[model samples]
Target: KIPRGNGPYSVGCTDLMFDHTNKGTFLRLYYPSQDNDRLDTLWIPNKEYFWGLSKFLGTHWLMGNILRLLFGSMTTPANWNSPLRPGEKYPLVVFSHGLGAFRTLYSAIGIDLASHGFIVAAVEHRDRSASATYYFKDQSAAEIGDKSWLYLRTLKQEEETHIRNEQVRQRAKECSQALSLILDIDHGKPVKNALDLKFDMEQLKDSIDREKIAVIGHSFGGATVIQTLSEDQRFRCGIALDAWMFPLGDEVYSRIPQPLFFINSEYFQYPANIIKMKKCYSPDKERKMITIRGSVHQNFADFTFATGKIIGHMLKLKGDIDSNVAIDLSNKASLAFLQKHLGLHKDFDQWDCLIEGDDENLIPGTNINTT
Candidate 1:
């Protein structure tokens, strides 16, 4: 079972689209909810996603069918289209998913942040970064719900150096655009719901703590965090989970003036990638990093919690550490960082010690030899 969030509030989930023609602002929103009785959100909402995963895994088409049969009807822990909790302005977090990952795949992070009373917008990319994502073409197409699907492009090895950075640039724009869209919604922007969903975007009006905004992501999304923070001054901070740094430009290194945190896994990072991360540090910027001892890169994504321990490890979806325990550490550390940077008032400060590598399973630093 995927773990429920430990925060005090119940979580709610919904989707958003502003100017469907642009294809850059579609997002899945997770927020604090009024109650927990609503139907759970579908974990994998599309069969096409399974087909994409099949290509990503280089497995046969039948494997996608088997995966859909096993996980298609599954529901995540969040309430579907539940009412937003009232009476407080919660902080906002704009979350980006890794390459080959769609917005729904990272509910583990989104739900936990929302449970802590933050509004989280998980952006879905249309730049051929996701395994598959759909967008309606126009009013004529909208009538029949006819959609266009964009699948991730398989780049040749020679194309990696140039193409990955281009994709990351587009991903960063999507992140900034999502943040602006959510901020606009918070300020009472009237956007018609693009999908026939039960949730209402009107509920978000005046519900956001506009001053406190952060960006967080895993893998390529992590690099997008760095890129977005550099380009957008509106985001107060960023947390990169197991960042894949190759997609970044060198100029972006010194441009991140806001506080940045790097939460990494033990086995997933190599010195080459970690080296790029180190370049982000400067005497003028607040920077801290830690490596989880028995973890892998996949530990940061929700799929780690979906499979059996033995099978998960064999598939590299999990690490030697327990999935729950690893996620708990990652989440707690993130909460502390968020509270520190966002200036939140809460019990998250209690986990501040973990930031210093106080836990036995966490190394105080990235732990990779830079020289």
Candidate 2:
């Protein structure tokens, strides 16, 4: 089971799609809520996503059904359509998913941030980055709920060198677009709740601390964080959780002025990736990187929490560290980094030393040698 948030406030979650057409923005939103019923949110809203995952993982078709059967009913720690917690303007965070991953897959990160009084929008990419994402043909077609899946592009070697950067650029645009949609919604935009749920989005009016905004993600999404912070000045800071560091351009390395944090897993650090990360560090920029002890690349993703230890370890999902412990450390460190960079007055900064590798479970810098 996915663990509940380790914070004081209850977390609420829901999906939002503003325009429903091919150009629509689909996102999973997690926020602090007034409702304390402890109701949980669906981890994966549709069975089709399971099939997409199977295809992405190259698993047998039967495994999709098995996975759906096993995980379909499981819920994350957020209440569905619960009322937003009132009387405070929460900081906003725009999140990006990794390659072949969708918005809801990162609920572990989203819920933790929401529980700490931040609004998180995990954007689902339509640029053929996700395993699958749906869109209606048009208004008339969407009225009847007609949907079509947009799958990820399989690239060749040359395409990998160029197309991947373009994809990351588009991903960054999507993050900015998600931020714009949410900010507009918070500013009283007329958007009906598309899900026919009980929660009213009107509560978001004037509820966002617009200046205290940040971007964060894992793997390719981490690269998206860097790219987004570079292209959009609206994002005050960013946290790259085990960033793939491949889909980024050379120009972006020196252009990112926002305070950035890199929380890496020990086993996933390669020399080339570390070189790119090192290139981002400059005398003028506030940059920090820490390696989590005993963690792997998958430790930064949700799939790490989805399987048994033995199976997960075999699949490279689990690391040498406990799943919960690894994620907890990652999330706490992210929270502290966000707090410090976004200038939010949160107690998370008390653990700011963790970012500097003060804890035994963390190494101050890259473990891999960058040539």
Candidate 3:
């Protein structure tokens, strides 16, 4: 659900489907509101997310549909399509979603950051990874999860996994390219937006704290954070949430020079991936590692917010883990890491009870700020 901030302005949002020629990409924008909105925004008009919302929440589909129909119209916490807040340049967080998830799934994280004086650009990978992403045919079209179609288009189709790895690397670059487009527009480049999301980058131009840039994601996006951090230095730091590390191609591991952190789940932290996380560790590298006990790979996503503990556990959204406990740990831990690296002067740093892994089974290691 989209969330709002305590800022004086109401939040506003709009959708942008960029570059229709090559598989068009869609993005949702949220900002603080100041005046009456001059733009019109539409919410997702579907009952599908309602039915599917159950598998995510750990509820039966039949009952889940009932709940969805009842509360589906309930606006998420973030104010939809508010104007960008005036004054300072907000810190920027460029985000990525898990393998099968879309940009919309991370609204909880995006809205939280926006409310706390940050601008988050969450990119939805076209046809390859998402369930139903839009693309440009003759015109913009909504392409549902076409696994076969994605299989043919993706890197995995290549005989050499190395080339496929390059394809994923290109995916990271493309996501950054999207960021550039948004930033360019924010800088008043006069680029025409194909999707009218009411975003005027001028309103946000100097409002971003350019020094405090970071990237974050769950699962595959976690791997994306690493690859992007390695390739893109504009990002000063990154936090990876329960990343799936099987796809790394040809020694990109030892080359990463920036500060990185990996927050892990009990189920997904294979010893091999753990070793890769350790490879970045050196006398010079700034890093931290923490394990949220009883959590699973899905814990980091919005699935943790799903109902029914049994259902969530089955989906790996819960692993003997409480939903509130898991999300609070993940979000607050992310906030702490970003604050320390991005120069946020907030009190989030005091959350070291987490870093010590001292909170029950939470584990901590490396150069973490334990104060």
Candidate 2 Cα deviation (angstroms), residue 164: 0.6
Give the runs in model 3 whose Cα sits over 4 Å from its true position: 1-12, 23-25, 30-75, 138-164, 198-202, 365-371
Candidate 2: tens digits of C-alpha lDDT, residues 18-53: 778656788999999996775688888787888888
CA lDDT scores, all candidates in order: 0.89, 0.88, 0.65
Question: Which candidate achieves the best TM-score against the true structure?
Answer: 1
- The lDDT leader among the candidates is 1
TM-score ranking from best to worst?
1, 2, 3
RMSD of each: 1.1, 1.3, 5.7
Score every model by TM-score: 0.98, 0.97, 0.79
Stretches of candidate 1 exceeding 4 Å from the true structure: none
For candidate 1, lDDT tens digit of each residue in 162-231?
A: 9999989999898888888888888888877667677888888999998999999999999999999999
Poorest lDDT segment (10 consecutive residues) of candidate 3: 144-153
